[PDB]
Amino acid sequence: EEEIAALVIDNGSGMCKAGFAGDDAPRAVFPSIVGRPRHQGVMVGMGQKDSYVGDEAQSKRGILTLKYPIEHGIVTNWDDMEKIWHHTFYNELRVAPEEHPVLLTEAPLNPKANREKMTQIMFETFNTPAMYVAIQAVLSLYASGRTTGIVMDSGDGVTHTVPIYEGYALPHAILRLDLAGRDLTDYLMKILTERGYSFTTTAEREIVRDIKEKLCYVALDFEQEMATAASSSSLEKSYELPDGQVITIGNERFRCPEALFQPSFLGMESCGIHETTFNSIMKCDVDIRKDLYANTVLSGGTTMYPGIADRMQKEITALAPSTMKIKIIAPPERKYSVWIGGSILASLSTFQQMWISKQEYDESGPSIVHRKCF
Amino acid sequence: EEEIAALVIDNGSGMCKAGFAGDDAPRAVFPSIVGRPRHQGVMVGMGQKDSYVGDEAQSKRGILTLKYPIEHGIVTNWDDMEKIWHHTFYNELRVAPEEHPVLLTEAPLNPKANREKMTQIMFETFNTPAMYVAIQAVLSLYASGRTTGIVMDSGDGVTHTVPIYEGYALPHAILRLDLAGRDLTDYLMKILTERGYSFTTTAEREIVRDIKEKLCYVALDFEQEMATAASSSSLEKSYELPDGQVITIGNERFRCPEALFQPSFLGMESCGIHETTFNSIMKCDVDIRKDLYANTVLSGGTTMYPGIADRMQKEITALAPSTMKIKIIAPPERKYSVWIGGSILASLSTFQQMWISKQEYDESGPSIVHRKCF
Amino acid sequence: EEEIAALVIDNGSGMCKAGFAGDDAPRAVFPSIVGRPRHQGVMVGMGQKDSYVGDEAQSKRGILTLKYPIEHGIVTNWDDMEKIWHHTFYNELRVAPEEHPVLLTEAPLNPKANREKMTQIMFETFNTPAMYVAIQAVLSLYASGRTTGIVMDSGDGVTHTVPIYEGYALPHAILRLDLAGRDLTDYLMKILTERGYSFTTTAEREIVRDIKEKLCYVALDFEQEMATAASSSSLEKSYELPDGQVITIGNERFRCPEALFQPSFLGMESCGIHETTFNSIMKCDVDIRKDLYANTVLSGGTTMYPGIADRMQKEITALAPSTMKIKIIAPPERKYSVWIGGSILASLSTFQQMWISKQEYDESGPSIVHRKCF
Numbered sequence A, B, C: 001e002e003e004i005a006a007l008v009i010d011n012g013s014g015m016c017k018a019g020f021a022g023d024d025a026p027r028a029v030f031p032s033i034v035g036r037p038r039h040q041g042v043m044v045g046m047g048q049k050d051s052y053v054g055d056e057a058q059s060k061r062g063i064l065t066l067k068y069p070i071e072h073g074i075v076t077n078w079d080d081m082e083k084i085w086h087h088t089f090y091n092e093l094r095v096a097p098e099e100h101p102v103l104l105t106e107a108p109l110n111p112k113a114n115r116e117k118m119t120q121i122m123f124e125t126f127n128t129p130a131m132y133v134a135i136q137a138v139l140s141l142y143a144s145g146r147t148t149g150i151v152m153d154s155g156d157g158v159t160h161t162v163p164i165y166e167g168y169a170l171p172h173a174i175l176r177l178d179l180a181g182r183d184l185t186d187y188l189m190k191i192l193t194e195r196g197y198s199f200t201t202t203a204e205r206e207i208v209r210d211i212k213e214k215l216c217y218v219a220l221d222f223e224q225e226m227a228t229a230a231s232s233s234s235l236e237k238s239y240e241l242p243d244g245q246v247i248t249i250g251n252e253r254f255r256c257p258e259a260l261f262q263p264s265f266l267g268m269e270s271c272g273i274h275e276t277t278f279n280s281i282m283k284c285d286v287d288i289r290k291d292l293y294a295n296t297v298l299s300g301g302t303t304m305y306p307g308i309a310d311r312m313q314k315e316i317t318a319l320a321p322s323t324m325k326i327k328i329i330a331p332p333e334r335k336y337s338v339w340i341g342g343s344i345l346a347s348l349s350t351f352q353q354m355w356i357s358k359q360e361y362d363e364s365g366p367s368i369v370h371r372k373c374f
């Protein structure tokens, strides 16, 4: 075949988004979880299967304890990650990685060890001709088809912010904020408890993740919505648990995402996301700011909440000079923006020379990740 | 011969159900009773036969006092149990236990001594190559051919409840309730007495056991049926005693099994069986409950009463979320479910390595029962 | 009189600890139980007394079914709670609550409804000039006379953990773990059953509570002590039941409290108490940790077991940096620490302005509990 295709994998914590480069959507997207049988089984002709990976784990949740192998964009446990990759290639895609160059995503400001060790695996686990490790935000910017913008990237892992002008990139300006979908989930299960509902375990932690993925939304003004919580009508929603129990969540709903804008709720000093955006933009040269204010791109799973764009618009506009208009461009299909970006990058002809080649690695070692790529 | 066959014995109190592993029904099933001649005989060329075991005792009832060696899943008297086993092997099956591995059933949450001592006997009474001691409920679940369910196990011994999901098993969730066929019998003979019929002795205690085994049934609503007892037509049934006397039992019939649902009748606080099932399910992880509500399996002799399934369905459905449908799967042939399960387990190839070997016992002692098996 | 005194009540589940503010020990401490006569009485000139409350119930146990009105720091049944409070004021203290401000304790992370409804009762049941509802852990920290520490609060209700530095308090850091004296009791009666002793009923459930309150102790290494259980000498203890029966409990003794450190025994994933303490400390700012490691305060009834402090010390030290010394401060009289703390708080002069006044409630409603107090 010509070009051999290429493979793309986005691993921020939470989800593996994988598929062939050269396609508009990934084939496989599943949760990055390694569940292990915590309870000793007593039958015969079970499994045994030491552990389960991917949406298999979601299916058989109750038995397993789940461990997310990636936290805050850092891989805690490598064998687990390897298992997840194993699952992606063999279980879903059904590819021999020897037959494809593979692109991996990775978060900014992230420890060296992760990139280096990542590469070490890809070469000396799944024998592969070539690979690349790329910054998440840039990819989403490509996916949006814009050359310039400040990409607000918040996955389940961690939140990141990378201003880009006319390509280029500003290292000093790049900001990384420790908040995530996962932190919101932890906050949320906390906030439910005041209502009586107690979710103590990893299994049901994912149930609240599911709740947040639909029921939660961001207030266009927090205090107003909280005021209107007095007369509860629309702000309460019934949710059905898999157990059959019913949950009814009012104001607690929208204050969950509020945390992004008020990390004091969580107890961290680190400024809210909008202020971090200003922190990024203010670090940039005076000249370019005009378009960065106007070209803010949101990416990653934890920007999905309804009404986030609007709130960011209102806050940034409030803070900034009203001399210039602040457009925020947040596409739907943002969740997959990183992966799409990866697809487009590996599809690019010129890119086909920038790969880290197996050969190059074998001569020069794993450390070469930083030398070559950003 | 290949595989040597294998032997299976179910001893919950009341009945010994024994036969060859690898068959769909046991060969021998007889009552676990050791009758002794209480009255001194005066002839010559009698017996003498110090005691009788199995349905022999049923045949010659009047003379003997019967002693059930097992109470509440605990063996009261070991020599008696040994005698019963003796009878099963030599009198019915006609096997040398040296030539067969033997599987025993045993109830959950049961004292260690019973398992340990049980094994001690099997090795150092009937010389046998290998053996295993297995939980009653699991076996019935196998017999039903389902991988998941909450098995409500009530024999004559005691009632037990073990939720199982996808194999696995939840120790904390396992529940053991002190009610049984035998307690119902004791209640029943009590309740007859208000009608005039007085059954004071072990002999006729078994007569009432027989009555209960057919005449008694469970109300689909207790109070309604008791109300309709005013106009007695169908609720009375003539029963013929072996004496030739006739008994006529009305409302007293169905309130006997009612006890399972209203242990206050018996005077115990311990919740009714349906509530215990909820107690089990509620102890389990939120995720799996959906299928446990739907996969409840009834086993054991004292689930045989007509209409039990229906009442359990109505009560559980009443208590639970009506969001999810509560199927109860109660096969006919449930009585023998444990034994069938044993047959299927010993028939399994892989199981053939999990046996407790004579050799292993000789090195490691009797205590190894818990170490190896559940 | 000057200052009017003030009243203090600690209701975590299990015990009501009540007395006058301004004294070093509470006057009345009795079990929070509402026993009801389950069996219909037949005499004349009995009671009748629909139910019994407090150590009255302990005295007349056999007849009654006992219901603990509080579970997991949540009041299940309000009328019952009201009855218990009734009993405290009228039966023991002999006070008119109109003549005293009353302080109540309450557990962290606890449902709003409990605080709100609690206040609703105190104002519209026992007419009272003022009241306050306070966090259990803080109170014990006061009682210990230290300004800083991480208070591990485990009653019979639930276990809680609140780090405090120089006063202040860290909401995000506060941890609440579902384990308790009551869960240990449930585990313990389970574990006895393997020995033959079967305790099926609420009455004798309290007998095992009593056993645990003395016989049980925590291993300074679990596996070592369990190993030494082979040669049983000191690890067995005879206990006398009220029935006159004697119980003999070996290794089963110490593995009961082991559960706090290995909740897998109970079947919960939730980490052990020491790990939860680390979970709390790790949530806190890097700066303060040094003194939290050094100032851990244990409170509540279910820290009473001999050897708990030592085990916590060994585990925390093992996990933490050995760069800094980990003192654990666990006073004897810890059981009463919450109540003492309450006494000292109501004694404080300035506190006398922070009360929730009857007047304030009447204008502003019950919801004001959260508004004013923590």
Ligand SMILES: Nc1ncnc2c1ncn2[C@@H]1O[C@H](COP(=O)(O)OP(=O)(O)O)[C@@H](O)[C@H]1O
Pocket (backbone or CB within 6 Å): A010, A011, A012, A013, A014, A015, A016, A154, A155, A156, A157, A158, A180, A181, A182, A185, A209, A212, A213, A214, A300, A301, A302, A303, A304, A305, A335, A338
């Ligand atoms: N539909 C949704 N609405 C709101 N939040 C969502 C939704 N889907 C996912 N999330 C949140 O975003 C997270 C997924 O982020 P993801 O894009 O997988 O990050 P990454 O690409 O870095 O792995 C989830 O864990 C969840 O908290």
Ligand SMILES: Nc1ncnc2c1ncn2[C@@H]1O[C@H](COP(=O)(O)OP(=O)(O)O)[C@@H](O)[C@H]1O
Pocket (backbone or CB within 6 Å): B010, B011, B012, B013, B014, B015, B016, B154, B155, B156, B157, B158, B180, B181, B182, B185, B209, B212, B213, B214, B300, B301, B302, B303, B304, B305, B335, B338
């Ligand atoms: N046909 C029947 N109808 C109703 N109840 C029955 C019937 N047969 C047996 N029982 C009750 O169930 C008991 C038998 O239980 P069994 O299955 O032998 O328990 P186990 O398997 O634990 O020994 C009897 O003692 C009797 O009380």
Ligand SMILES: Nc1ncnc2c1ncn2[C@@H]1O[C@H](COP(=O)(O)OP(=O)(O)O)[C@@H](O)[C@H]1O
Pocket (backbone or CB within 6 Å): C010, C011, C012, C013, C014, C015, C016, C154, C155, C156, C157, C158, C180, C181, C182, C184, C185, C209, C212, C213, C214, C300, C301, C302, C303, C304, C305, C335, C338
């Ligand atoms: N002397 C003791 N030794 C060991 N455990 C005890 C002792 N006394 C009480 N306990 C355990 O602690 C519990 C009492 O906790 P308590 O302090 O009343 O909690 P709270 O203050 O939240 O009500 C009892 O139920 C028992 O399990």
Ligand SMILES: [Mg+2]
Pocket (backbone or CB within 6 Å): A012, A136, A154, A155, A156, A300, A301, A338
């Ligand atoms: Mg991402």
Ligand SMILES: [Mg+2]
Pocket (backbone or CB within 6 Å): B012, B136, B154, B155, B156, B300, B301, B338
């Ligand atoms: Mg049985």
Ligand SMILES: [Mg+2]
Pocket (backbone or CB within 6 Å): C012, C136, C154, C155, C156, C300, C301, C338
């Ligand atoms: Mg307490």
